[PDB]
Amino acid sequence: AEAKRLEREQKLKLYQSATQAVFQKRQAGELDESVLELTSQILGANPDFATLWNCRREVLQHLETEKSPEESAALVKAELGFLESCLRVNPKSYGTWHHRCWLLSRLPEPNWARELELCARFLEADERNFHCWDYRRFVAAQAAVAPAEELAFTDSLITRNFSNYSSWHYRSCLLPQLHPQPRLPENVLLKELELVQNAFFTDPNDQSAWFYHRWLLGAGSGRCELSVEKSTVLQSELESCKELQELEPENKWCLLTIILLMRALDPLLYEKETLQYFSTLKAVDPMRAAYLDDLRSKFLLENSVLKMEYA
Amino acid sequence: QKDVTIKSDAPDTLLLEKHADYIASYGSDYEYCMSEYLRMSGVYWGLTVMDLMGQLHRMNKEEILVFIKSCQHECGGVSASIGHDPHLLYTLSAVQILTLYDSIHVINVDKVVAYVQSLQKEDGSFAGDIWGEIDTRFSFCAVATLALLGKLDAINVEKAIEFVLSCMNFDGGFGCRPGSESHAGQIYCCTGFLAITSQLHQVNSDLLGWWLCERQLPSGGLNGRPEKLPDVCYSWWVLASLKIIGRLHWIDREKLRSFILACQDEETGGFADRPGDMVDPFHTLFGIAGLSLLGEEQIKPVSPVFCMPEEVLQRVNVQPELVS
Ligand SMILES: COc1ccc(S(=O)(=O)N2Cc3cc(C#N)ccc3N(Cc3cncn3C)C[C@H]2Cc2ccc(OC(=O)NCc3ccccc3)cc2)cc1
Ligand SMILES: [Ca+2]
Ligand SMILES: [Zn+2]
């Protein structure tokens, strides 16, 4: 108690004094290496202290004016190591990741392949770190990496383990890029439906696949236009979800998906079953009862409009 | 599945008097000193929660107005504290505070407007400061700040709208920048932005509303994205968003309230992020603001857009229409 709790009033005084000294130096116009020394001591533990990242940038901008290409190149490499060490301690600080982007954005011949590996590494540590995924999209653009390559990266990440919301999200942005119009092609859609279906039949409790599948369900051309292949694939998904329902009667995602599939197939033909599935799902997921009633009301309106369009 | 189990001896009643004591005495300490980099926002959280509880008078108006004036720089931007650098985040917080106090002319309003205007990029986005970080959080800071000053026309609104809509995702939500994954925090900023700019018709309320209502875990608490732990601030980001888009009834209010109450500290006062953890004024604002949106009678009505008392916004006449 007395050792550790007391220790931080000593740590506070160091941060207190180092911070004082940084502002002293800064008001003096002393844009030198001593500020880099002092800020390294504070930013390691406290990377959300934005003003100190600004001081580092001011120092580096100044020093690059009065140092050689070699000395400036050496400062940049020291800055990359500092940044990596900071990210190891706190991989979720906005300030640290932005400083890295700022840094890499102003280099003449930056090494983007290396940066893509830093990303793959942090993403092994935490596959959901959105700062890292954001940095990866930044690096992919800067290095003009093709969508196909990033698509190959997501697949590998899909199958090695769970925690895939971030990787499915990235796929949802990449797929439209591989077929860029001013709505996926059915062939692409069918392949995606097969991949996602594998995922949620493998791990039926992970919501990310089910969310993505709901999107794919709307991403096509309409039920009036169902190919025999798409019709058959959706009917097969329906039967496979009913199978899953037998094994996992309290799995809410498969029940919701059954309703969505019946909609995608034939709203009026499956009207009776849709209504039955709504009662079951509401009993299984009572917190979503209000949502489920509103969705049901929506679907009934849709059905009424279909029935009135009758000849 | 990732959830917190609320132990049965967790608080189940609203301890208002202890919270006002907590905030009134806040800043009289280790954590205080280390959060100087967000001080202006810290002051906004304290003043706003006190004002929602009718206790604003217990804070130091005169001392806050001097602090704010000293935090405006020559560029017009406001810093979090004396000596720190200007940023949209603290410029917003300062303007919110001066709005709570009807003291906007404490600062140079023309210069704040020029500062905000200067941070907009060709694609319509906003940087948070001169160092260029782009985030939809800053699109919200910019138009919220300008809405409160009656100066929304000062920026390129159509371009700003285009940028925010370019951050909309497959799931109806929004991230930091184009292509970024949906996160409750950014959803809150972007729906708030679309409220201010009158563009809620561009949101898919049924789709986004479902994503948001699926944030509620068996515990009653809301998380910020799939497969994460619930907490009190996420509970505000999600509920506020749902209210803006007209779908607050898609969550279980009574389970949420119980979660929020269980985050209170019965002895020290204030709220923490989750039950039994260390309180702070941030989660205290958001717990309190969350309960008010849920209907709690002892708390003034709060704007889901500005996270300020509705009566304050009524007085300045900035009350954006919500979906329903
Ligand atoms: C306790 O350790 C931390 C960790 C991170 C931070 S932070 O600088 O990155 N920031 C502030 C923050 C403040 C407190 C307090 N008191 C507590 C947490 C916290 N966090 C950390 C956190 C919260 N929940 C999970 N975590 C890990 C993050 C962050 C929160 C924050 C900061 C600025 C914000 O400002 C705005 O978005 N403003 C736009 C705005 C303003 C008013 C109304 C509407 C929108 C909002 C939230 C601060 C302390
Ligand atoms: Ca007073
Ligand atoms: Zn939180």
Q: Which residues, other chains included, contact B262 with Cβ-Cβ below 8 Å and sequence gap of 6+? A: B6, B10, B11, B12, B275
Resolution for this experimental structure (Å): 2.0
* Three-state secondary structure call for residue B302: strand
**B277 contacts chain A (CB < 8 A):** no
Dist. CA A9–CA B265, nearest whole Å: 25
- From chain A, the residues in CB contact with B213 under 8 A are 287-288, 291
Nearest residue of chain B to residue A211 (CA atoms): B171
Q: How was this structure determined?
A: X-ray
Question: How far is the centre of ligand 2, averaged over its atoms, from the C-alpha of A88 (Å)?
Answer: 44
On chain A, the residues whose CB falls within 8 A of the CB of B226 are: 165, 207-208, 211
Q: Which residue of B has its CA nearest to A218?
A: B170
What does the DSSP assignment read for B30-54? HHHHHTGGGHHHHHHHHHHHHHHTT
Q: In this structure, what are the phi and psi dihedrals at residue B126, rounded to the nearest 5 degrees?
A: -120, 135
In the block, which residue shows the tokens 């202890």?
B18
Chain B's closest residue to A100, CA to CA, is: B133
In angstroms, the CA B4 to CA B20 distance is: 27
- The number of C-beta contacts closer than 8 angstroms across A and B is 104
DSSP labels for B112-173? HHHHHHHTB-TTS-BBSSTT--B-HHHHHHHHHHHHHHT-GGGS-HHHHHHHHHTTB-TTS-
Q: Crossing angle, helix A130-142 and helix A112-125, to 10 degrees?
A: 160
Asked if A286's CB is within 8 angstroms of B252's CB, the reply is yes
**Opening angle at CA A81, ends A78 and A84, nearest 5:** 150
In the numeric block, the tokens 């970024």 are attached to: B180
CB-defined site of ligand 1, < 6 Å: A 48; B 38, 41, 89, 92, 137, 140-141, 233, 273, 280-282, 307
CB A193 within 8 A of CB A216: yes
Give the number of residues written for chain B: 324
**Domain layout of chain A by residue ranges:** 1-311
Contact B270, B23 (CB under 8 A): yes
Are B159 and B105 contacting, i.e. CB atoms less than 8 angstroms apart? no
**CB contact, 8 Å: B250 with chain A?**
yes
Fold of the A1-311 domain: 1.25.40
Query: Which atom of ligand 1 is least distant from the CA of B233?
Result: 24
Q: Quick check: B227 and A16 CB within 8 A?
A: no
Query: Using an 8 Å Cβ cutoff, are A292 and A282 in contact?
Result: yes
**Collapsed DSSP state (helix, strand, coil) of residue B4:** coil
The first and second tokens of residue A156, run together, are 């590998």
d(CA B78, CA A64): 29
Indicate which ligand has the atom closest to the C-alpha of A49: 1
Extract the tokens encoding B71. 């935090």
Q: What are B134's strand-pairing partners?
A: B127
- Interatomic CA distance for residues B213 and B126, integer angstroms: 29
Q: Do B84 and A291 touch (CB under 8 A)?
A: no
**CB-CB neighbors (< 8 A) of B83 in chain A:** 23, 51
Instruction: Report how far residue B85's alpha carbon sits from residue A302's, in angstroms, rounded to the nearest whole number.
Output: 55
- Cβ(A287)–Cβ(A251) under 8 Å? no
Structural domains in chain B, sorted by start:
1-324 (1.50.10.20)
Cα A147 to ligand 3 centre (Å) = 34
C-alpha torsion B242→B279→B225→A139, nearest 10: 120
Nearby residues of A257 by Cβ (< 8 Å), 6 or more positions away: A210, A213, A214, A237, A241
DSSP secondary structure code for residue B273 in this structure: S
| Alpha carbons B71 and B82: distance in angstroms, whole number | 6
Spacing, Cα B29 to ligand 1 middle (Å) = 19
Helix, coil or strand: residue B216:
strand
B71 is in an annotated binding site: no
Two tokens, residue B141 = 């800071």
Query: Which of B131, B183, B247 has its CB closest to that of A130?
Result: B183
In contact, A241 and A253? CB cutoff 8 Å = no
Exposure of B119 by Cβ count < 10 A (0-12 exposed, 13-18 middle, 19+ buried)? buried
Interface test with A, best of B167, B181, B249, B258 (most A CBs within 10 A): B181
Could you tell me if residue B81 is left (phi over 0), alpha (psi between -120 and 50 degrees) or otherwise beta? beta
The first and second tokens of residue B205, run together, are: 């309320």
Residue B80 annotated as part of some ligand binding site:
no
C-alpha span between B32 and B164 (Å, rounded): 34
Task: Please answer whether residues B302 and B239 qualify as being in contact, where contact means their C-beta atoms are separated by less than 8 angstroms.
Answer: no
Nearest to B179 among A51, A137, A211 (CB): A137
Return the structure tokens found at B268: 């020290």
The DSSP bridge partners found for residue B13 are: none
B183 is in an annotated binding site: yes
| B132 contacts A102? CB cut-off 8 A | yes
